[model samples]
Target chain A: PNTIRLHRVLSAPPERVYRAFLDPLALAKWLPPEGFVCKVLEHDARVGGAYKMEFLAFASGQKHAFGGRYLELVPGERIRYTDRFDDAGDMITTITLAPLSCGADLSIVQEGIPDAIPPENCYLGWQQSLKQLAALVEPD
Target chain B: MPNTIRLHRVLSAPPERVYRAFLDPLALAKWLPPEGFVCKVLEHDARVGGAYKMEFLAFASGQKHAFGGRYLELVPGERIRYTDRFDDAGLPGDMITTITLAPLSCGADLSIVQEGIPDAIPPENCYLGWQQSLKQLAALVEPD
Candidate 1:
């Protein structure tokens, strides 16, 4: 019943935007919410591989760890993975990239969110992450 | 330490039939759950990268647990790999179950390795459930 949908038009080629999704470093650079630093503890981009991440609040040093498995990896087209939250269970995260005149039209849909997490917080979190993602992939 | 469960079973059915038993939602509903639980498939797309959703209802108590995942790899008569999770507050991370099939003298040899199962769920419990489910699979596929 809970789903978060987001769309961002990036000034980067579809492949570039697609690459950002799999690169562990790029993920660590862009994925955490504002003021939180992320560490990619383990990452395997291929389908069926596992990935783990730890996020720390920069000032407070408070941190939490989460991990998931890659479910689908279609180069330059689509990426779907499962994201695990300690309190909320499993969420299926999907990203679709399409070519655009300026660059790429990106879409994200995450389903299976538990009631423990308020959707408003998740929405805000992704907006911050997407802003950073633009900063990461839009550079020449 | 990875919370893995492995199982093997041989059925007196051709590899194709045995493989179909998994992809076909009807067959899955008939046999995927343990001896006492009933299964209901919400949606299934058998293609690679496609997603499937389903739930199991325990007959005794009517308790249900829902889960779903995408088809990571699908090879006709050879292999099937996908992810699974319990739709609950226990987030033990995603679990991947890979099934490999081989042709025996007269049927199919199947191997199952499910990794990343919740640490709270003992391997022996999964072992018992898988054994019961596979026995049902044998009943469903071994006839024809």
Candidate 2:
């Protein structure tokens, strides 16, 4: 029942932005933050496609897996996918991307019970993910 | 010239879920890092024709002021757009928004860009806010 939203502008063009979203190499460059690491279990970015990913925390070595199918896909413009874990992966979570003035922006929306996870926590997580994205695209 | 763009996303959920994070009281509780401290704002209301306010405190002395205008545009699970500001004092800056389920994608792409703020608002600042907000949003959905 609770929903969370986030946005970011990248320096790269829409094509480059879309590449980061679909390409494994670009994702690996900035998927997880410094304290955490990510491994792509699968990478098929297209409508009706499915893939998996595992994020391992560096400190505790704790890991989490999430995967789903692409409900919609628009090259260099938008992508829609349902995400969930292997066990309860049926809980359909949708993620999207769009072209903006600066570059491409992304959003992920998870639906389920209100008590499952507070919406505020979702916002915090998005903030961290976007931070990783900014660090990745911004010129050093 | 500075670039300005808009993004959107849709969640098969309710508006409260999207609006709650913008609330000053709730935002302070979960908007900061697991180790850093975040302060609450004095007042905030996330409704059409209403105003909102909040702030993020990174350290004892470092602080970031955040606030926004009422929903000039609002549509349940369809769309939402609002103007945002920085300082507590009345100021006009970037106009930001988030739109739900679109024909193109099931997810929303929250977008923002400065409207009118003398030098207070920089193109980089807009980019930074977008980055922070997106990361926070992902954390909100993904489990710990």
Candidate 3:
């Protein structure tokens, strides 16, 4: 029952932050940690749609391949997906967005993190990714 | 056994510089938070059994979460060990963080071990915050 939950208020509107989650270019730009690059093999941003991508760590040249299906999507509100890593098991992720007076309140719940992947590193990756996501979405 | 999170990073700064960054209040306040947050060091004492407190504030909202702990051990230019706990009631548990530094030709090798992370706080959040902070730390100490 390993799960991770994160909450943050971003300075961007819900629409912008929501769109960044599905956009391939935006995903590539912000999903990976700093000094890492993402390559999207395929992307279809709709319910039941599937996508695949690979992330390469710059210094070590390490690669992590993952794919998932969009289980649910509510524009500017929420997204649910299932991610299966090449080496790890599947995990469900739900992202919810609520409009805040200043911007957007973003909450993420990722369940079933495999024991093979250190939770700290996973948390670190999301932290870096969220920072990138903020940079991409907050800019007018 | 307590839950522990470990991380390693190769930085482009000397061991001395990297070591000082952990204890220097100004340096810690500057580099300890994520991109959209700022840290304020309320109190810091760099000695054995010394105590410190810091607040992390969101840049746009100014909302803050304050935490404090005591230094359990310190080895100049090499290691640091401390305890941390949040003031918020919603967040429970005490965390002990240890940082180790080793000399490298390019710079320094840094290892971090954080123990006793509460179940209520996602481990990934800590990971992310540290990544951002370390990136800032590297930027601060790497420049000639």
Candidate 4:
């Protein structure tokens, strides 16, 4: 399993961090890399509910479409889902949250990254996405 | 714990007809409930992001167990996915249901996958309930 793990401490609480995973608008805002604009095509926010999204590259006007289903959802604690890309492998992503006196801790473990994508590139994209996540969740 | 239930059957009808049966309030009310219960569609908005409400009225005790959900994906005559949940607090969870239809030489092929069923309800009970409903569906769709 080609797994990538990342952790961050957010100023927001657990609930807000968890809601970022399900809310279509919030997810579309923060999910894509810095070079792309994300669009949520179809989303049903529940276990087993599927979601489709498109990430449009700013310079090339290229769009990549991906979709998957929610495997599990726990209100402010955890979320698990699968992501499938055309011509790519299936990846399962698990996100966990824990409340702290200062804020909350967010952890993400993604498994099954196809060899087509470099692990360093994945980490770079995730870092960019986390920047957006922070901007969205760290506010009131 | 969450669960997934899958079902399949072939109906003596077209894909359009089978798809319509799931979205139409009138048609659904006619065949959705199991025996000894009546179905009433309180509100049904069939489009994506639309909401639907319905209940099964028990014939013996006249009790109602209401449920409702929103449409997620609807590919006419091909696929449908939505979320369902009980109104009661005791049985709390969102269950996703996906239906797929394919055309056959003589009729249409139907497959249903219902996932994230509530922990309070047994998987077998839901399977039996759908089994009864499908029997009625056969009656409604296996006609000229």
Candidate 5:
């Protein structure tokens, strides 16, 4: 069972900004906000390719590991994946990215068993991730 | 004319964690309160060529002013450069923001510069805003 959601936007055009997401160096530079550090353990970055990301919450001395596979991939267009918050031993989320207006007018929808994890908590996490993503794509 | 104003604060927590608050809207909404004011982001896009908008409201006067502009630069946990103005079709005011988070010192130093103000907008207002923003940020990063 899955709970899905959507967000829409009109941006500066799609392709111009889509490449930033695929470039690992660029991803490393801006994927996390100011203090948090991100290390991409593995990134095939293609359809059916497996990708993993490690996040170090330097402020809290907490570390988060998450990654998934590209179930569906359309270069500079759309991406779908399954993700887990902690170790791969626990499966918790799925995400989708749709390029609109050359930007990730993307959506990272999550659905899980009720009480296992609250919906509001998941929403907050995704919201923060998107904020970081937005910051990453900002041009110099 | 360029009026450069800065706000710097050293939190009890590491600068890295302090820096994370900027990316976490939930964290921001909680800590973005100063003296008697709060900030609500109408739109905040931190990426290149992206636009950001936020409004700050005072509890007493309920006086609210919309601020934020496009992000000209984004350097993760190290630096950020964004402009500041009322809105898209508004006057030609620009602000350049730079933040440096230190590891050993475990604090952050924020540098800000605004150019092209009408002179009526006193530099004191900028100082006041940063002081409050920093206070709010500190409170958020160091939650009780």
Candidate 6:
């Protein structure tokens, strides 16, 4: 079983960053890596709620469907979810948010990354996704 | 043992487009550097045995490093092999990079093998940097 861990300091409050993760529109805007667009088919952000989405590459229009269930949720603090691709196994992701003087310190731990997918790509994708998340949440 | 690194990526683009992105100077400058860095292609020649030179500059500090390479082999839209060496003497040995592109029903499959990585440099850094470059390449080639 492979896993990835990442940390970032965002220039936004914990509440804003936390909300960005659960907001459908914000998630659609920031979740996909560059050159991809996201369409949320279903989104319910509470515990036991499920989310289904599709990521379409801009040029080729290739679609990748991903869906998951929320396992844990603590407002402005932590979130736990299970994500699975149409062709792959499940990955559990946990996000923790801590308040900082200026903004927030965020840590993400994702376990069970499929061997078929390269870890470096996942790392890079998250790096770009977090940049987008910061852009969406840091302004306000 | 000699250091070698291999990576594979599937992109939603044709082999021609993926191959072209490697030789095109503008495209190389756009997609070659990792995030937070800029690339300048000083010289480029896409023919077999041709030479190229480029500089990569850090965005924040403006620090720069130059590397140049010669194309050892070229098969249009299929394969390319080159040799790269840094301008700095501290960086020892030439790095050989070979790229192969295969056309697929949905897109192109790319395989890359890089050999002779300097012992001083970390392989993980190269893996991370190449991942960023490939992401940029995908963005460049996948869109209409």
Best by lDDT: 6
DockQ of 4: 0.01
TM-score head-to-head 2 vs 5, winner: 2
Q: How far is candidate 2 from the true structure (C-alpha RMSD, Å)?
A: 10.0
Model 6 spans with C-alpha error above 4 angstroms: A1-140
Over B1-144, each residue of candidate 5 has an lDDT whose tens digit, in order, gives 136554434455565676677666677666765668777878877687798777778889998877777877766766666676765344445656666665433344333444555355555455445545665676667554
Task: Give lDDT per model, in order.
Answer: 0.84, 0.56, 0.84, 0.84, 0.58, 0.87
lDDT of 2 by residue, A1-140 (tens): 45454555565555665666668776766767567788998988777788788888989999888777778766666666666754431444444656565565555566652455555445545555666665666553
Q: What TM-score would each prediction reach against the true structure? A: 0.50, 0.50, 0.56, 0.50, 0.44, 0.56
Q: Score residue B49 of candidate 5 by CA lDDT.
A: 79
Which wins on TM-score, candidate 1 or candidate 3?
Answer: 3
Q: Which candidate leads the pack in DockQ?
A: 2
lDDT per residue for candidate 3 within A1-140, as digits (tens), equals 46877666677889999999999889999998889999999899989999999999989999989999999899889999999988727899999998766578788999988887755556556767876887889787
Per-residue C-alpha lDDT of model 4 across residues B1-144, encoded as one tens digit per residue: 148777766676888899999999888998999989999999998899999999999999999999999999999899989999999999988999999999875578788989999888866567657866876887787689
- Per-residue CA lDDT of candidate 3, range B11-128, in tens? 6688999999999988898888888999989999999989999999999999999999999999987999999999998888999999999987667778899999887775656655
lDDT of 1 by residue, B1-144 (tens): 359877655567888898999999999999999978999999899999999999999999999889999999999999999999877867566899999998876577777899999887755567557756876887899884
lDDT of 1 by residue, A9-122 (tens): 677898998989889879989999879999898898889999999999999999888889999988889999998855427889999998766677678999988877766567
Off by over 4 Å in 2: A87-101, A105-108, B1-144
In model 4, which regions exceed 4 Å deviation? Answer: A1-140
Q: State the lDDT at A2 in candidate 4.
A: 76
Which run of 10 residues does model 6 chain B get worst, by summed lDDT?
Answer: B120-129
Q: How much is A108 displaced in model 6, in angstroms?
A: 18
In the order shown, the candidates' DockQ scores are: 0.01, 0.14, 0.05, 0.01, 0.01, 0.06
